Ligand binder design. Structure first.
Ligand SMILES: CCCCCCCCCCCCCCCCCC(=O)OC[C@H](CO[C@@H]1O[C@H](CO[C@H]2O[C@H](CO)[C@H](O)[C@H](O)[C@H]2O)[C@H](O)[C@H](O)[C@H]1O)OC(=O)CCCCCCCCCCCCCCCCC
Ligand code: CLA
Ligand code: CLA
Ligand code: CLA
Ligand code: CLA
Ligand code: CLA
Ligand code: CLA
Ligand SMILES: CCCCCCCCCCCCCCCCCC(=O)OC[C@H](CO[C@@H]1O[C@H](CO)[C@H](O)[C@H](O)[C@H]1O)OC(=O)CCCCCCCCCCCCCCCCC
Ligand SMILES: CCCCCCCCCCCCCCCCCC(=O)OC[C@H](CO[C@@H]1O[C@H](CO)[C@H](O)[C@H](O)[C@H]1O)OC(=O)CCCCCCCCCCCCCCCCC
Ligand SMILES: CC1=C(/C=C/C(C)=C/C=C/C(C)=C/C=C/C=C(C)/C=C/C=C(C)/C=C/C2=C(C)CCCC2(C)C)C(C)(C)CCC1
Ligand code: SF4
Ligand code: SF4
Ligand code: SF4
Ligand SMILES: [Ca+2]
Lengths: 74, 31, 154, 80, 74, 143, 733, 42
């Protein structure tokens, strides 16, 4: 729970890309302040949303991470 | 007059109260 | 053909897959020096991929609607290379392994401290025994006929 | 109250008696072995069903058997 | 032994100097794989004329903060 | 035939500081146990419920809420130290009941005054099938 | 007695909360009750059977009444394809305004539930048209269940209770149940189909007030007795026929076409009438086998004892089996449960491929729900059959009366059976998992053509032998000069071959390598579950680790920590372990079915055909992909009608997870925690004034295994049902 | 030496050396005859 909290909060309110005006687009547009308050938000906005990267890893150089995902489930 | 308006509270609130009170009373003391 | 599949060499989806595969690797080769270590490695695997597709085409595999080489195991003689001759090879190797192990177990069963020779292998005895697996089929056949393969009394 | 039985294969080693937490078993005279002793269970109303006695029996199969049965507050080892 | 392995891999099978030239475009990676069964796909494009497995140990940052500029020092 | 020792109240009890592992309501309403030993000297011993207590030189009488706890303390007293102990069971009546050692000699030592209770004169493999005692209140082992 | 429970004295004297728990969980174990005889046992069984019948009838009439009262039936019969059927109304004071607006569907005046039981299509197929029909039906069923209760009471007094001699009369009971319970019932159903349903599917409304005024056929009952039965098929419904209209209708009442109804995509009603008539004739003729008061017929015992092979390969054959079956109730229950479970999953497999109800093939999520429901029920029934086999072997098995017959010889070579079951399951598991992992690695390295796809050529060959023409095998029924194809070419083969070679239905779907791999997963599941259950049954009477297990009962904690440790050594523990594998295998089965059909219903079968051969495909393209609407049932931007499933979906995840507690954490831990809780309560002011009456104890060992299994399975069922209904209901296709 | 020969034949070390040899053999075989879905010689 601690590392999930850290990862979501960082990808939602700190990390992201800055631009020319100083407009900061975060990895997730502050979706932690409104979606993390119910368990459906954790299952949908965190796991289901963030989980897509690893599922599509196959066929690229991050394929080993997909393989380890499935093997660890096993 | 709306029949659910009466039977859903009674069967969902009253009936379990009565039944559980009675069944506790029956199970939890010596004859 | 068999199960509605078509000879990969004459299929269109099988070719399309080959060209698509080869296409992406070529892209990886680009943006680097034309004759660099990474570029040379990418070239090598491109040639390897072309060889694999041509080898599949040559061996007469069956391709479905996805262009993937399906394997027939019904026993059709046009396809023994897919399952049955590798199966005979496997059965030979596995009988080798099992027979050598059984031979060893029987040979060490007569000492006072037989567990000593199980946690610590007698490698001289093992190397004397390994090569009987070569003839394991004949030995096992004659042991069954003799009636000494299966323990009576049990 | 659990039910403890002693069978005539008992060699009268007495290891089980020395194992029981609640003093259920005992050693009594007999004539069917070389120790002239056999295990008795005169106080099974105090047996907690721990079955330490069975793990201490060196016979095969066991000579001391504990059949768990109706529970008492003595049988359940409850201090409240 | 583990530390020496890390330093040697950073010396020999790394893109540490390329990363040192341009830190925020090159991805650090100090492990390559042998092309045996097609696993060389794991040798992804980490930039810098280098193909390997992007590492997350943060070792490049330590080596840069210590002043290590060549692979002779590693 | 070994008149059991009678419990002597006014016998002191070990020096303890108190614990939350002592007696409870069950000792008030159903029963509790009392163990006694005699202590060649004043020493420290681990309590079967909490920490450490000091047994007094002279009679020691300790009240426990479980017979198993008493036997544990008795074993520890008997083999770590070399001390002979006896324990009783007390009911809310004011009755006491000498419990152990029942006939003066420890049960690991055979005594010629004991009868056999729950002994079967056959090997455990000769119990009848449950089908043989179906619909009668008996158990195949109780036979 | 003098306390709950009274059927048990040992539990009534238990001063702990256990007495309550166990008091509930042994209420129907009549053989372990105090003062039990055989007469009491049999009479109690009879009475509770009557009670179960009453419950069933009350349940089905509740369904009918609610569909009639708060339902959608009259509107639904007008346009079965473009209106959703309503199950019942919702009244929930916890609902919010947007939820009220979101759940009001189907043209209702308030929040309602959409029915997925398929009762609308069933009742529409058999003849019900108006709400008055459903009201009469519900009233009749209330009447029937009241009479069931009355009979259950009447057969419990003296003055009417039967003797155990009566209950063991097997020949007459079989005679009646075959000829009467199965035969006359099926005959009567054929009568209803011919008199009410077939006319109802042609415009006419035959009811009680006029059915003596209507001929089912223009030449009623003439053909039947004159022998000219063909006249009852001389004019079938033309293939351009709207279901409950007379446009394109015929007059035939019995026929054998084999295809589907073109508009409804279901079986012809006249075909079902003919089928029930035929099997009624078969049951009636076959129910005159066994001997009763009339001096003719068979004696089951003699047939059993006469079937012993010379040469003695079967020992004493079936000598003594009649008495061990007739006297053992658990043997009878095991046989009944086995047959019932097999035919239950047969129902599940036949109802999706050969639909019987009109417009149910086009309601996709009704199909999915029905299939999954019946398959899970069949799995539970199979596990129960094996559990009662084990219970029989413990309680009712008599070794010396069964000397050397088939039962004893089963018991005496149990090692060979168990070892070979284990070999088969090891082989299947090793190789199925290995092929799946090989494929997964091949696709992770970006090389699709390096996969080990095996064409399911035997199943494809069988499909060819049924008439399918997509693999080009040219066998029976897809040959052209075969005797098989020529012999039925005029009766049912036209319709059959037309339906099977159509690829928009589910009759013999096209299969590929993914089907091969998943079928072998299914085979492994079956073999491992049967390994666990058979090992539990054949080892129930004792093993080498505990040779005297039989006198410990069916269910017990363990045999202490001695001899190495004997946790989960009961046969009950074997059942407990096998339920996990049953759940897992039925999960594989239903996952396979749902994905194949959900890709077929979208016209995207290549999506399955290609991504089903590696497990990342199953995870991503099936689980993660089809779960978006469900988890979006409610979000920070509002909720929709799927919210109730989105909630239940998480519910099933919670329940499942807490089932892990009772399965991982063990009794000792909890017992000591409870004892310190008891100290705390007794020691605190203003609350020690209140005293419990049973000393709180941690759950038993077996009780905890049971509770954990119940939680696990409930969570399982609920989350999968939520996902299935929400993913099919969301796309509605 | 004699005892070193003994220890080098204890079960874990014997099996790791055996499996390393087997791995080397299989690796080289598939390095010479790569991407083999069948037996194409006879
Ligand atoms: C091309 C067409 C023509 C082909 C002709 C093929 C011929 C067979 C192949 C090679 C033949 C030469 C083998 C190498 C030369 C020396 C082999 C030898 O005598 O080396 C000695 C052994 C001796 O074999 C048998 O060995 C058995 C067991 O002895 C010992 O076996 C072990 C040997 O280390 C252990 O010492 C063990 O403790 C002990 O029992 C028997 O009891 C007999 O002593 C003996 O006949 O032969 C062995 O297998 C040595 C190990 C290799 C055997 C290879 C057999 C063929 C494959
Ligand atoms: C097993 C059949 C069954 C089932 C599952 C339901 C289920 C439901 N009914 Mg219902 N009902 C039934 C039969 C059934 N009914 C019958 C036969 C009648 C008489 C024709 C009614 C008349 C009825 C009315 C008038 C209403 C409901 C309502 C409801 C819903 C609210 C829950 C409730 O208030 O309880 C049901 C309330 C009742 C008064 C039911 C009493 C009649 C049955 C026979 C009682 C049986 C009790 C029995 C002793 C226990 C059986 C054992 C077993 C079920 C555990 C609910 C979905 C309410 C609703 O519409 O929700 C929106 C509503 O107002 N029902
Ligand atoms: C994903 C979880 C999982 C897996 C993989 C298995 C797998 C297996 N179960 Mg099991 N089971 C599970 C969960 C699982 N179970 C759960 C939750 C329960 C409920 C408690 C059970 C209860 C249960 C029972 C009661 C039984 C089994 C049995 C079996 C075996 C069946 C035989 C077989 O299929 O051949 C093999 C299948 C495999 C999947 C093995 C694959 C593993 C490969 C070999 C790894 C290869 C190692 C590789 C070289 C690298 C290793 C890494 C390195 C660090 C060493 C099998 C090994 C039955 C049995 O024993 O069979 C005789 C048995 O009776 N299971
Ligand atoms: C016609 C079907 C049938 C019949 C008549 C019986 C009859 C019997 N079974 Mg049996 N059984 C069956 C099917 C059947 N079973 C099936 C299908 C299974 C597989 C699941 C089992 C597995 C089974 C086992 C393992 C055992 C029995 C036992 C028994 C005997 C005592 C049962 C009892 O009173 O316990 C009391 C009744 C209960 C404890 C039920 C209460 C708890 C249930 C399981 C929870 C219900 C789920 C939950 C409430 C619903 C979800 C909640 C909500 C959120 C939806 C009894 C003679 C027991 C026995 O004594 O053997 C001789 C025994 O141990 N059965
Ligand atoms: C012709 C005489 C006759 C008839 C009609 C019956 C009828 C019945 N007996 Mg009885 N019996 C008889 C003679 C008869 N018996 C005699 C002479 C004896 C003395 C030996 C007995 C002794 C006896 C005992 C001891 C018991 C019965 C029981 C039963 C009931 C069985 C349980 C049940 O209802 O399941 C229903 C069965 C069916 C509907 C037919 C089976 C259908 C199969 C399984 C599948 C159908 C598939 C099809 C697609 C279904 C469509 C589904 C769709 C519509 C939704 C049943 C109503 C049991 C009972 O009383 O329960 C209360 C029972 O305990 N009988
Ligand atoms: C158990 C089911 C069942 C029942 C109760 C009925 C009942 C009835 N049918 Mg019917 N029927 C049935 C099945 C059934 N049928 C089936 C399966 C078919 C398809 C072959 C038919 C086809 C049919 C036709 C074509 C007609 C009836 C008719 C009738 C009515 C007059 C019967 C009569 O007096 O004939 C005489 C009875 C006998 C000669 C004795 C029969 C010998 C038995 C077996 C003893 C009657 C109410 C007639 C009618 O007018 O409907 C109102 C009518 O013409 N039925
Ligand atoms: C999701 C599964 C799950 C859940 C819900 C729990 C829940 C709990 N665990 Mg547990 N645990 C689990 C898995 C789970 N565990 C597993 C898998 C293991 C194995 C490692 C353990 C091992 C474990 C240990 C060793 C211990 C616990 C303890 C506890 C309790 C902590 C005290 C507490 O939180 O109070 C609050 C209760 C909750 C937070 C549960 C949810 C409450 C719901 C949301 C309230 C709803 C009320 C509702 C209105 C009820 C009315 C409904 C009506 C129809 C009747 C708690 C009830 C500890 C304990 O006992 O505490 C003293 C303890 O020591 N757990
Ligand atoms: C090729 C695939 C098929 C191979 C079939 C090989 C022959 C199998 C039948 C003969 C088996 C056999 O002789 O041993 C049969 C073995 C026992 O083997 C018997 O042992 C006896 C005592 O030592 C005698 O030596 C007999 O000669 C011997 O046959 O048992 C069985 O297999 C049961 C079958 C009947 C015998
Ligand atoms: C690595 C080679 C180890 C060689 C070895 O142990 O044998 C050589 C000897 C074992 O050999 C023993 O030697 C003894 C005197 O040292 C006696 O002579 C014994 O007779 C002789 O068997 O062990 C060693 O000396 C190696 C010491 C550790 C080296 C690392
Ligand atoms: C434990 C136990 C028990 C139980 C058991 C069981 C549970 C069993 C089962 C089983 C099962 C579950 C079985 C199944 C089966 C089936 C079968 C065996 C089948 C079949 C069939 C056939 C032969 C077919 C044929 C055909 C036809 C007819 C036509 C078409 C073609 C075909 C080929 C398909 C008891 C109590 C008894 C006793 C004790 C022990
Ligand atoms: S179960 Fe425990 S208390 Fe009872 S006799 Fe055995 S060891 Fe002693
Ligand atoms: S341990 Fe077993 S054999 Fe020895 S005395 Fe006790 S019961 Fe008898
Ligand atoms: S189930 Fe519990 S008491 Fe029984 S052997 Fe296992 S750990 Fe011990
Ligand atoms: Ca079709």
């Amino acid at each position: 729970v601690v590392i999930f909290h850290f990862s979501w909060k960082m990808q939602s309110d700190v990390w992201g890309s800055i631009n020319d005006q100083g407009v900061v687009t975060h990895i997730t547009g502050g979706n932690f302040a409104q979606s993390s308050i119910t368990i459906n938000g954790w299952l949908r906005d965190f796991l289901w949303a963030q989980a897509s990267q690893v599922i599509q890893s196959y066929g690229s150089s991050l394929s080993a991470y997909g393989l380890f995902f499935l093997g660890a489930h096993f | 007059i709306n029949l659910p308006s009466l039977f859903v509270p009674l069967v969902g609130l009253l009936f379990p109260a009565v039944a559980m009170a009675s069944l506790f009373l029956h199970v939890e003391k010596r004859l | 053909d068999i199960a509605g599949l078509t000879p990969c060499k004459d299929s269109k989806q099988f070719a399309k897959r080959e060209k698509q595969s080869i296409k992406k690797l070529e892209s990886s080769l680009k943006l680097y020096a034309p004759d660099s270590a990474p570029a040379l490695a990418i070239n090598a695997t491109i040639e390897k991929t072309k060889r694999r597709f041509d080898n599949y085409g040559k061996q007469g595999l069956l391709c479905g609607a996805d262009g993937l080489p399906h394997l027939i195991v019904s026993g059709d003689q046009r396809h023994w290379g897919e399952f049955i001759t590798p199966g005979i090879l496997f059965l030979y190797i596995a009988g080798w392994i099992g027979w050598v192990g059984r031979s060893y177990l029987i040979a060490i069963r007569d000492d006072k401290k037989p567990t000593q020779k199980e946690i610590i292998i007698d490698v001289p005895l093992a190397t004397g025994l390994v090569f009987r697996g070569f003839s394991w089929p004949i030995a096992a056949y004659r042991e069954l006929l003799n009636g000494e393969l299966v323990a009576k009394d049990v | 109250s659990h039910s403890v039985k002693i069978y005539d294969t008992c060699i009268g080693c007495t290891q089980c008696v020395r194992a029981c937490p609640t003093d259920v078993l005992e050693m009594i005279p007999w004539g069917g072995c070389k120790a002239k002793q056999i295990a008795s269970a005169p106080r099974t109303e105090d047996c907690v069903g721990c079955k330490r006695c069975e793990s201490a029996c060196p016979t095969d199969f066991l000579s001391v058997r504990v059949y768990l049965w109706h529970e008492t507050t003595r049988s359940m080892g409850l201090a409240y | 032994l583990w530390l020496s392995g890390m330093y040697f891999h950073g010396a020999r099978f790394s893109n540490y100097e390329a990363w040192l030239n341009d830190p925020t475009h090159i991805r650090p990676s100090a492990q390559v794989v042998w092309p045996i069964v097609g696993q060389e796909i794991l040798n992804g494009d980490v930039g810098g004329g280098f193909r390997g497995i992007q590492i997350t140990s943060g070792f490049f940052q330590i080596w840069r903060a210590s002043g290590i500029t060549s692979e002779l020092q590693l | 035939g070994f008149t059991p020792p009678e419990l002597d109240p006014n016998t002191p009890s070990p020096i303890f500081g108190g614990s939350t592992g002592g007696l409870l309501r069950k000792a008030q309403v159903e029963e509790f146990y009392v163990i006694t030993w005699e202590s060649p000297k004043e020493q420290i011993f681990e309590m079967p419920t909490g920490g450490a207590a000091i047994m007094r030189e002279g009679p020691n009488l300790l009240k426990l809420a479980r017979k198993e706890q008493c036997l544990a303390l008795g074993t520890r007293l008997r083999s770590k130290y070399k001390i002979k102990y006896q324990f009783y069971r007390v009911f809310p009546s004011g009755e006491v009941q000498y419990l152990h050692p029942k006939d003066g000699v420890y049960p690991e030592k055979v005594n010629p005054g004991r009868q056999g209770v729950g002994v079967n004169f056959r090997s455990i493999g000769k119990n009848v099938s449950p089908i043989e005692v179906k619909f009668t209140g008996k158990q195949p082992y109780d036979l | 007695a003098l306390r709950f429970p009274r059927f048990s004295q040992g539990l009534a004297q238990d001063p702990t909360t256990r007495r309550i728990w166990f008091g509930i969980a042994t209420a129907h174990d009549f053989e372990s009750h105090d003062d039990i005889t055989e007469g009491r046992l049999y009479q109690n069984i009879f009475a509770s059977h009557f009670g179960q019948l009453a419950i069933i009838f009350l349940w089905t009439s509740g369904n009918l009444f609610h569909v009639a009262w708060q339902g959608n039936f009259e509107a639904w019969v007008q346009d079965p394809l473009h209106v959703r059927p309503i199950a019942h109304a919702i009244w929930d004071p916890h609902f919010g305004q947007p939820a009220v607006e979101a759940f009001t569907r189907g043209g209702a005046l308030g929040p309602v539930n959409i029915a997925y039981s398929g009762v609308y299509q069933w009742w529409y197929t058999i003849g019900l048209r108006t709400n008055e029909d459903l009201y009469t039906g519900a009233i009749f069923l209330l009447f029937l269940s009241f009479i069931s209760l009355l009979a259950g009471w009447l057969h419990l007094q003296p003055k009417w209770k039967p003797s155990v001699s009566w209950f063991k009369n097997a020949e007459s009971r079989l005679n009646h149940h075959l000829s009467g319970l199965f035969g006359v019932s099926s005959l009567a159903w054929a009568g209803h189909l011919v008199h009410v349903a077939i006319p109802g599917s042609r415009g006419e409304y035959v009811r009680w007030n006029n059915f003596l005024s209507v001929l089912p056929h223009p030449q009623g009952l003439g053909p039947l007795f004159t022998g000219q039965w063909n006249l009852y098929a001389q004019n079938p419904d033309s293939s351009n026929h709207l279901f409950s209209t007379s446009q394109g209708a015929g007059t035939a009442i019995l026929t054998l076409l084999g295809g589907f109804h073109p508009q409804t995509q279901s079986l012809w009603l006249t075909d079902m009438a003919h089928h029930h008539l035929a099997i009624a004739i078969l049951f009636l003729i076959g129910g005159h086998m066994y001997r009763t008061n009339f001096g003719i017929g068979h004696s089951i015992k003699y047939i059993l004892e006469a079937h012993i092979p010379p040469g003695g390969r079967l020992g004493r054959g079936h000598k003594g089996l009649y008495d061990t079956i007739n006297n053992s109730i658990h043997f009878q229950l095991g046989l009944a449960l086995a047959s019932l479970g097999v035919i239950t999953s047969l129902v599940a497999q036949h109802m999706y491929s050969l639909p019987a109800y009109a417009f149910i093939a086009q309601d996709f999520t009704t199909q999915a729900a029905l299939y999954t429901h019946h398959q899970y029920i069949a799995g539970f029934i199979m596990t129960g059959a094996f559990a009662h086999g084990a219970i029989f072997f413990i309680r009712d098995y008599n070794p010396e009366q069964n000397a050397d017959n088939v039962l004893a010889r089963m018991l005496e070579h149990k090692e060979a059976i168990i070892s070979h079951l284990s070999w088969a399951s090891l082989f299947l598991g090793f190789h199925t998992l290995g092929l799946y992992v090989h494929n997964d690695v091949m696709l992770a390295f970006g090389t699709p053509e390096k996969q080990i796809l095996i064409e399911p050529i035997f199943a494809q060959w069988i499909q060819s032998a049924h008439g399918k023409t997509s693999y080009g095998f040219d066998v029976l029924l897809s040959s052209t000069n075969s005797p098989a194809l020529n012999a039925g070419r005029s009766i049912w083969l036209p319709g059959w071959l037309n339906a099977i070679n159509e690829n928009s239905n589910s009759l013999f779907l096209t299969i590929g390598p993914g089907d091969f791999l998943v079928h072998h997963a299914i085979a492994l599941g079956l073999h491992t579950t049967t390994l666990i259950l058979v090992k539990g049954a054949l080892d129930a009477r004792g093993s080498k680790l505990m040779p005297d297990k039989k006198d410990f009962g069916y269910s017990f904690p363990c045999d202490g920590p001695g001899r190495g440790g004997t946790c989960d050594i009961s046969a009950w523990d074997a059942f407990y372990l096998a339920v996990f594998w049953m759940l897992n295998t039925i999960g594989w089965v239903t996952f396979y079915w749902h994905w194949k059909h959900i890709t077929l219903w979208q016209g995207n079968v290549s999506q399955f055909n290609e991504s089903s051969t590696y497990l990342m495909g199953w995870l991503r393209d099936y689980l993660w992909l089809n779960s978006s609407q469900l988890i979006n049932g409610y979000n920070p931007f509002g909720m929709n009608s799927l919210s109730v499933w989105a909630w239940m979906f998480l519910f099933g995840h919670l329940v499942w997870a807490t089932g892990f507690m009772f399965l991982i954490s063990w009794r000792g831990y909890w017992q000591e925690l409870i004892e310190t809780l008891a100290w705390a309560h007794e020691r605190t002011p203003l609350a020690n004034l209140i005293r419990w009456r049973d000393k709180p104890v941690a759950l038993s060992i077996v009780q905890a295994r049971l509770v954990g299994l119940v939680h696990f399975s409930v969570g399982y069922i609920f989350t999968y049902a939520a996902f299935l209904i929400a993913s099919t209901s969301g796309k509605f296709g | 030496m004699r005892d070193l020969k003994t220890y080098l034949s204890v079960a874990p070390v014997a099996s790791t050396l055996w499996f390393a040899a087997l791995a080397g053999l299989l690796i080289e075989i598939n390095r010479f005859f790569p991407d083999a879905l069948t037996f194409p010689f006879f």
